[PDB]
Design a protein around this ligand. Structure first.
Ligand SMILES: CCCCCCCCCCCCC/C=C/[C@@H](O)[C@H](CO[C@@H]1O[C@H](COS(=O)(=O)O)[C@H](O)[C@H](OS(=O)(=O)O)[C@H]1O)NC(=O)CCCCCCCCCCC
Ligand SMILES: *[C@@H]1O[C@H](CO)[C@@H](O[C@@H]2O[C@H](CO)[C@@H](O[C@@H]3O[C@H](CO)[C@@H](O)[C@H](O)[C@@H]3O)[C@H](O)[C@H]2NC(C)=O)[C@H](O)[C@H]1NC(C)=O
Ligand SMILES: *[C@@H]1O[C@H](CO)[C@@H](O[C@@H]2O[C@H](CO)[C@@H](O)[C@H](O)[C@H]2NC(C)=O)[C@H](O)[C@H]1NC(C)=O
Lengths: 97, 269
């Protein structure tokens, strides 16, 4: 009935400083389906795209956001997610290594 | 191997706000969507049309369209007449595997609620009391039951057969992953976390392992295989190990697109 979301963050391609890449934020296993997902660079939102909402056998929801990004060893990225089951928004950082 | 599956997500916030979106999967590719805004469905692939004629599609469209409006109206009326409280989340899943076996299942507030067996609406064993009223009203409308029967037994199968034929090549493409290694956060004292990333592979079945030469290493933790925007996959596999033992560890990747020629990545220092 109410399932909190699980959040995972990963790049499409091996992160090499300077090469254009894509940052993925996969949010899954949640219910109900209304959810806010933002991709962040040093705190600020960045232009992300988002796939259609879809769902698994047990009826939970899953969804993919991704954003074009160019990593360098300076900047940090994260995924911020808002859902009814969360008292406070949940931030998951992209860990390069 | 490749199942077809049609999905509906309906939400009713209150009596004034509602939305219904749909999509469908064939194996792991998404041929269609029907967004709330659209009066029609999107063919997301050049093979999405299958072998279905234009008149056949138009008919199916219209059927689905009437259904979407009628469905919405019917829920609202079931809510008023049965005093069920908002918000509501309703999910529907149909589809078939050719052996040919069709289903139409429904969930409410995230739990299985009813389905369509044979020619009847049947309540799930676990369903709340009031859906017995729903089932009753639904099993009265003969025309709907006939339209559902016809969809599941006549239309789904003929469709799936066609788009399997036209989507055959894109469905069974093989796409080689790229892969890399990294040093994750320390899991404790003198323990290190070695991470093996594999990304860009399609189809989804993949074996990824830590190793000493030919000896598979257990303590290898699988991550979840998760999607990429381009419908290829990503998988992260880790190992917990002591700083002395770092000697001669390799990650090894088996994938259908590689044949017998696996990808090996070595740790150095
Ligand atoms: C409290 C709620 C919680 C419970 C949640 C579960 C509820 C189950 C959901 C199932 C509800 C299905 C309701 C069916 C809606 C029907 O109104 C429509 C059309 O009804 C037709 O309207 C017709 C008149 O229409 S009008 O001229 O425009 O007014 C006729 O009355 C016709 O009867 S007939 O004897 O003449 O043939 C009648 O059936 N049922 C359908 O359209 C059936 C097709 C179902 C397609 C399912 C596909 C789902 C897959 C999702 C992928 C996008
Ligand atoms: C999902 O789709 C439904 C149905 O397509 C949307 O509801 C519809 O929205 C339209 C246009 O926005 C509404 O039009 C209204 O018409 C009346 C005329 O009497 C007028 O009072 C309003 O000013 C407006 O023009 C219409 O009420 C409504 N249609 C139905 C069948 O409910 C719905 O908003 C979409 N969902 C979301 C979240 O957008
Ligand atoms: C019905 O529900 C919808 C969606 O939940 C409500 O629309 C929102 O209402 C807030 C006010 O709290 C406004 O900021 C916007 O108008 C809407 N936001 C979103 C995210 O939709 C609507 O208020 C509700 N209608 C009634 C009569 O309760």
């Amino acid at each position: 009935i109410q399932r909190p979301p699980k959040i995972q963050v990963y790049s499409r391609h091996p992160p090499e400083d300077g090469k254009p890449n894509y940052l993925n934020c996969y949010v899954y296993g949640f219910h109900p389906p209304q959810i806010e997902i933002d991709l962040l660079k040093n705190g600020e939102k960045i232009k992300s795209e988002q796939s259609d909402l879809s769902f698994s056998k047990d009826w939970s929801f899953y969804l993919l956001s991704h954003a074009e990004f160019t990593p360098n060893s300076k900047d940090q990225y994260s995924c911020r997610v808002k859902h009814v089951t969360l008292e406070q928004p949940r931030i998951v950082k992209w860990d390069r290594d | 191997p490749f199942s077809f599956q049609g999905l509906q997500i309906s939400s009713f916030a209150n009596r004034s706000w509602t939305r219904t979106d749909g999509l469908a999967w064939l194996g792991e590719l998404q041929p269609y969507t029907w967004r709330n805004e659209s009066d029609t469905i999107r063919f997301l692939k050049p093979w999405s049309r299958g072998t279905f004629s234009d008149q056949q599609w138009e008919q199916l469209q219209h059927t689905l369209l009437v259904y979407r409006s009628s469905f919405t109206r019917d829920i609202w009326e079931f809510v008023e007449k049965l005093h069920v409280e908002y918000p509501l989340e309703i999910q529907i899943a149909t589809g078939c595997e050719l052996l040919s076996e069709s289903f139409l299942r429904a969930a409410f507030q995230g739990r299985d609620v009813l389905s369509f067996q044979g020619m009847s609406w049947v309540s799930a064993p676990d369903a709340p009391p009031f859906i017995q009223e729903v089932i009753k009203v639904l099993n009265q409308n003969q025309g709907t039951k006939e339209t559902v029967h016809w969809l599941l037994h006549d239309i789904w199968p003929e469709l799936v057969r066609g788009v399997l034929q036209t989507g055959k090549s894109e469905l069974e493409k093989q796409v080689k992953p790229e892969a890399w290694l990294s040093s994750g956060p320390s899991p404790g004292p003198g323990r290190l976390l070695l991470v093996c990333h594999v990304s860009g592979f399609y189809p989804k079945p993949v074996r990824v392992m830590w190793m000493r030469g030919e000896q598979e290493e257990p303590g290898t933790r699988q991550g979840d295989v998760m999607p990429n925007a381009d419908s290829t996959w990503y998988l992260r596999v880790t190992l917990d190990v002591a700083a002395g033992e770092v000697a001669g560890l390799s990650c090894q990747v088996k994938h259908s697109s590689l044949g017998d020629q696996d990808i090996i990545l070595y740790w150095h220092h």
